[PDB]
Amino acid sequence: HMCLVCSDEASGCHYGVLTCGSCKVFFKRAVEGQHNYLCAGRNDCIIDKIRRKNCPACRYRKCLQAGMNLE
Amino acid sequence: HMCLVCSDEASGCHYGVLTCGSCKVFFKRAVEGQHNYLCAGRNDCIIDKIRRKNCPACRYRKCLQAGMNLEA
DNA sequence: TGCAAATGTACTAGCT
DNA sequence: AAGCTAGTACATTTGC
Ligand SMILES: [Zn+2]
Ligand SMILES: [Zn+2]
Ligand SMILES: [Zn+2]
Ligand SMILES: [Zn+2]
Numbered sequence: 280h281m282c283l284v285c286s287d288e289a290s291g292c293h294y295g296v297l298t299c300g301s302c303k304v305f306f307k308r309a310v311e312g313q314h315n316y317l318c319a320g321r322n323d324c325i326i327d328k329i330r331r332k333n334c335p336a337c338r339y340r341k342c343l344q345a346g347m348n349l350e
Numbered sequence: 351h352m353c354l355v356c357s358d359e360a361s362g363c364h365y366g367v368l369t370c371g372s373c374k375v376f377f378k379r380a381v382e383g384q385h386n387y388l389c390a391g392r393n394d395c396i397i398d399k400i401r402r403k404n405c406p407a408c409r410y411r412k413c414l415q416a417g418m419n420l421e422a
Numbered sequence: 423t424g425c426a427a428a429t430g431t432a433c434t435a436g437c438t
Numbered sequence: 439a440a441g442c443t444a445g446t447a448c449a450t451t452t453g454c
Binding site: 317318319320321323324325326329330333334337 | 386388389390391392394395396397400401404405408
């Protein structure tokens with residue numbers, strides 16, 4: 280049902296983790312190239328369906344916390 | 351020289367405040383436009399040249415705090 | 423791909 | 439002429 284990164288409607292198990300469609304694309308872009316993202320808050324931004332765009336840094340952090348990788 | 355909102359190179363005194371071009375257009379669009387801006391932290395984000403895209407809600411907040419206004 | 427929103431740039435209109 | 443800003447069109451970015 281739910282994406283482990285942002286809590287949207289998951290579309291499948293992507294990169295080892297149940298994740299929504301946009302978190303799937305986001306993580307792919309993040310690992311592939313630069314992910315030198317800078318958080319504007321305190322590195323604990325709320326990553327939900329609407330706010331997940333706000334902070335790539337915290338979102339890529341949750342992606343790693345959830346265990347996403349290339350296997 | 352310095353935009354008092356994002357610290358990008360200022361473009362002039364826009365709407366009462368020395369600001370860059372991107373903050374000028376952003377402020378007018380924020381006032382006159384419909385937006386679903388929601389902060390993901392604590393309504394207290396850092397706004398600089400990079401992080402200004404991160405949180406428009408705090409950016410709009412910093413705009414008003416700097417004294418920006420569509421009048422004179 | 424395809425479409426729309428958000429953002430930023432560069433320019434023009436108009437004043438003083 | 440200079441020197442200024444608000445408005446606006448275009449380009450880019452970003453996300454579905
Ligand atoms: Zn997600
Ligand atoms: Zn963050
Ligand atoms: Zn600015
Ligand atoms: Zn914020």
